[PDB]
Amino acid sequence: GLKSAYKDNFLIGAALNATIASGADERLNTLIAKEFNSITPENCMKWGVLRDAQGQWNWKDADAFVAFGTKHNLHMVGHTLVWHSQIHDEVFKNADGSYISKAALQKKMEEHITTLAGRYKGKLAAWDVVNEAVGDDLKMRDSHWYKIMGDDFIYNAFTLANEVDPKAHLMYNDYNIERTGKREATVEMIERLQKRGMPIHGLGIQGHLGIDTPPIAEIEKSIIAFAKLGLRVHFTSLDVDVLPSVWEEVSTRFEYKPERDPYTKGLPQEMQDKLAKRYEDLFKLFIKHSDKIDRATFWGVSDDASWLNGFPIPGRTNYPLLFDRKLQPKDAYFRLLDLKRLEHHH
Ligand SMILES: OC[C@@H]1O[C@@H](O[C@@H]2[C@@H](O)[C@H](O[C@@H]3CO[C@H](O)[C@H](O)[C@H]3O)OC[C@H]2O)[C@H](O)[C@H]1O
Ligand SMILES: [Cl-]
Numbered sequence: 562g563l564k565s566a567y568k569d570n571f572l573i574g575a576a577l578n579a580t581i582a583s584g585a586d587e588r589l590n591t592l593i594a595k596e597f598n599s600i601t602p603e604n605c606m607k608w609g610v611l612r613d614a615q616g617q618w619n620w621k622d623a624d625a626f627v628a629f630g631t632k633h634n635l636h637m638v639g640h641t642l643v644w645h646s647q648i649h650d651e652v653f654k655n656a657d658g659s660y661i662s663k664a665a666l667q668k669k670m671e672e673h674i675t676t677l678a679g680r681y682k683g684k685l686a687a688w689d690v691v692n693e694a695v696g697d698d699l700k701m702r703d704s705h706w707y708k709i710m711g712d713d714f715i716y717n718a719f720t721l722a723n724e725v726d727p728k729a730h731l732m733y734n735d736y737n738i739e740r741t742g743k744r745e746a747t748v749e750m751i752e753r754l755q756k757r758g759m760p761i762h763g764l765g766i767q768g769h770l771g772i773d774t775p776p777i778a779e780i781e782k783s784i785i786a787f788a789k790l791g792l793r794v795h796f797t798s799l800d801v802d803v804l805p806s807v808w809e810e811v812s813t814r815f816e817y818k819p820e821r822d823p824y825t826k827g828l829p830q831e832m833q834d835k836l837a838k839r840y841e842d843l844f845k846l847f848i849k850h851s852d853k854i855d856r857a858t859f860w861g862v863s864d865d866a867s868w869l870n871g872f873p874i875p876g877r878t879n880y881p882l883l884f885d886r887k888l889q890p891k892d893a894y895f896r897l898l899d900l901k902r903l904e905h906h907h
């Protein structure tokens with residue numbers, strides 16, 4: 562499978578939802594063991610999913626994920642310690658809406674990281690310590706984290722994670738950093754935190770790509786720029802959106818319309834071909850820069866369980882991954898295998 566074909570290049574990973582990570586699906590257990598040598602929990606280690614609004618913890622799904630990776634001897638990436646999404650407003654705010662102090666939030670971060678990264682110390686090889694800190698306007702994202710703590714929210718998150726599990730490979734992770742503008746803003750931020758002595762080992766490019774954009778050349782610039790920071794590059798959340806885009810009026814663009822969901826009956830072969838060529842282009846690039854890249858993780862296993870079916874428009878039928886809704890490999894899968902099977906060396 563993919564993991565074996567790409568053995569000499571990088572890990573091949575998948576994000577697993579809680580149903581998959583339970584181990585109850587024999588067909589996926591088989592598929593995953595064959596294809597992937599790394600996994601990431603799709604949701605269960607996120608603050609607002611793992612904990613309730615009162616801060617109470619429920620380990621069932623997170624433990625099941627770690628048990629699954631241990632059972633199958635898979636490299637495991639924790640996702641994610643500090644992020645502005647899927648986290649209760651109660652972490653940051655009093656019931657009246659007012660923000661708590663920097664000191665009070667720091668205490669909460671310390672408790673969260675110490676507990677979560679501590680539980681799985683030595684079991685998870687890597688952590689997405691901070692996710693999505695640069696805004697799409699290229700300034701620091703105006704989250705509660707940032708408004709209360711400043712850039713110390715990032716510095717302190719990495720410091721704490723490194724104290725709790727000194728052996729973990731600590732990553733900053735973001736989307737659209739394949740693109741000019743955000744790439745450079747991210748480079749500058751990381752540069753300035755590295756200067757301050759922040760422990761950081763890796764840089765995650767999410768890789769939520771469109772069928773057309775961004776071009777390979779922009780992605781290449783990012784691989785090269787982030788590697789120059791002395792960081793290992795990971796592609797963390799790969800998928801290819803094949804459906805009409807709403808990214809380019811502004812307030813109805815997220816509503817369901819049938820014209821924006823044109824493949825409910827199946828993805829036609831011509832689009833299968835385009836999708837296969839797009840993934841092939843991408844993996845050619847990755848192979849080219851295998852010296853800089855530790856991992857390529859897909860944000861799901863099969864198309865039936867992709868988040869892009871419901872984002873950014875609820876209820877669509879998307880086709881973003883390497884396995885179809887019956888778990889059969891798509892044409893894109895075979896193009897990826899052929900890149901390695903037919904590789905030329907001395
Ligand atoms: O519809 C219910 C549920 O939604 C899906 O999970 C979503 C995640 O996949 C999503 O992951 C983020 C994707 O963007 C970035 O890569 C980020 O780093 C990821 O955490 O987060 C929102 C979730 O709703 C599941 O597919 C499905 O069961
Ligand atoms: Cl899940």
Ligand SMILES: [Mg+2]
Pocket residue numbers: 631683684
């Ligand atoms: Mg282990």
